Design a protein around this ligand. Sequence first.
Ligand code: NA
Length: 300
Amino acid sequence: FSKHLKEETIQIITKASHEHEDKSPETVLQSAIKLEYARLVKLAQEDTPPETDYRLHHVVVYFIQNQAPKKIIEKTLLEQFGDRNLSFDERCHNIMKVAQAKLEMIKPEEVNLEEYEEWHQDYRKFRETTMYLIIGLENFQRESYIDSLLFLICAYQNNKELLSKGLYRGHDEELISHYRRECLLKLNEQAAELFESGEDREVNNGLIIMNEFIVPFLPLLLVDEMEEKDILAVEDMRNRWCSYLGQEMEPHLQEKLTDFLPKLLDCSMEIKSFHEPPKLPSYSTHELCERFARIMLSLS
Ligand code: NA
């Protein structure tokens, strides 16, 4: 469904046609599927730099690395060669009709439809998780920590869920953990700087950060005693806000602090924030790959 994929599909069909004297669409389609699978296996096998992730380029690379059933990969490839955008060109039109014909013949014994859809839903979630991560890091790099946090929280949770299904399902946990934690710490420091400002408008914004973002999401860093850097980060944030009470405070500011400080100190009763995830924009595969590369090359 892309210029790159449509042209890659036509190119592989033409290369397939040269493999046998018989040029029937049934013969060519079988050779084209074998050639395309081999092309995607090569991508799946490649050791790539951090800015490139061939799982983002094609669902079948994700399926290979995650050891999806062969018949599920085969049906996915048949759907590629049966796509209506192959319908105009003389080289691919009759192959496309043969692929559409074979898709109808597959029996539920060969491909369970719910299993097929589950695999494609995993890949959809992997792409969504990647975009949450991209936007989270793009905002982090711009020092826009509120937008960064909400997207990184979603990337982190999605990713843990994906990786519960298998090792090749998701993204580097250390990377997302680091930026989720650093984002909370930076946003907390921004809140404290505003709280100290002595300008009522800036103080109010610091308090919005604490009441709307830091206190509600603090439990996320406490869910796992094994995540020691997360636990240490929470203690550092709690220490920062208690330190104001080590000397006399102006009474109005003290009241605003102790309005939220008990909930910062013990968030065990409100582990779920019920906050809605931010919405993702629409995106192409090319855009997903380009933006992933760009943020990986811009890490700070
Ligand atoms: Na890579």
